[PDB]
Amino acid sequence: SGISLDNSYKMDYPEMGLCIIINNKNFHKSTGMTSRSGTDVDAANLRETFRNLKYEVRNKNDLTREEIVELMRDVSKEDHSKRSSFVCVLLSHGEEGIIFGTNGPVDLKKITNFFRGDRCRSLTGKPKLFIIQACRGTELDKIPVEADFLYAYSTAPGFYSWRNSKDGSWFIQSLCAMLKQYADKLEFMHILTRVNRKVATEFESFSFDATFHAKKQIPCIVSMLTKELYFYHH
Amino acid sequence: SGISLDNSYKMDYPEMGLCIIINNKNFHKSTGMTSRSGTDVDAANLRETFRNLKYEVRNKNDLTREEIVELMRDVSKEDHSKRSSFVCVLLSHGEEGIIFGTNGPVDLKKITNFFRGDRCRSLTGKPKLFIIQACRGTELDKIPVEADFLYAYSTAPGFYSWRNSKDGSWFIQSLCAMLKQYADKLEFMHILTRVNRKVATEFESFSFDATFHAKKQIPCIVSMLTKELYFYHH
């Protein structure tokens, strides 16, 4: 054959892969965590968006910390040989490096470690995308086993992340809109960059509380990918 | 005079000192933090307890993060020359190293730094006690400027701290009971040790949620004191 380049991930496997959406809206009273109004809008938006990208979407609602770990463990033990990639979307409360189950926190590392290059062989060398809509603090504005991971954080390290009770979270709203408009044209990093601009320029908080009023947000793309990622092929 | 020993803090100054009680019960809706039912019982219990110890108690309710810092700054700028010690009680939500104002978190270091040996000269060499009833995580069960500080934590590092909506927090209930019974007999560390035993043996959570049910708690005494502390003198 002619000259071959390996600058982009092979996305023409029989299946694009799984898109696991963990939508946590209602939390156990004992946790003292509020209901995440609008997250259902996000979950539905994501389901539709990734459905159009040909991902096998599995929407899960209100999972405990135990259920989250078990689900991720089970998913990581599946045969992903015929799958091009893996996507996991986490919609919940959170802190830096943490995502909340309905009854308590789960270390993000715990979840992501299941898919490490040496722990999930059928996904080795394939893009593993983790999209996280959760706060990361309280501020207001052979190959490496960690390789091939992409973390699309809704907000910068140490900052709160905003969610509108009616329209859904700023990040997810923007992500879905950009994926819908550019998934068949742009490389993923460029799509996430558009998401960054959309969130940073089109949103500002409105609150009766001066402390939380007129605040801005900037998402945070964390890439350990080794190749360009296009959702389309050939 | 005869042989003199300097094993205990001089507690016979004209005044025992200030006892600042920050009682945060209701938080701004935007923070998503629950109301701390029972904390008023704690605040009243502490006020009475320290009143009997002859401390100049100042009860503050529902202070924002800005108000907490300002209060502590102002208090640290007062003349404590005629005061034997300083006590600050913090009742609020919290995380490891953090205490919540009604509208957001405050680094505990921020608060305590105001009273460092080199920043509050009228308190240099005197015991500075910080009693903290707040969670420290989500787990369930010349002289140094940092010298002369005592941190009476309600719970161990990384753990939740329990509060009963009717009787008040486990730690504060126990602390006040032990101070009332032993303040005129035992050295402070021994009193806090009794508090540890009382909390560890007399309390167990009851919750309809299996995750938070039948849990135990152990307070955490952190001492940087250089002398024994007796609330009584001569």
């Binding site: 509020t34 995440r36 109004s37 609008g38 919940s92 409360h93 959170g94 809509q133 959760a134 706060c135 809704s154 709160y160 992340s161 905003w162 969610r163 509108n164 009770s165 979270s169 908080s205 409105f206 609150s207 939380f212 | 935007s30 923070t31 998503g32």
Partner: peptide
């Protein structure tokens, strides 16, 4: 608008 609410924070997560």
């Amino acid at each position: 608008d609410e924070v997560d």
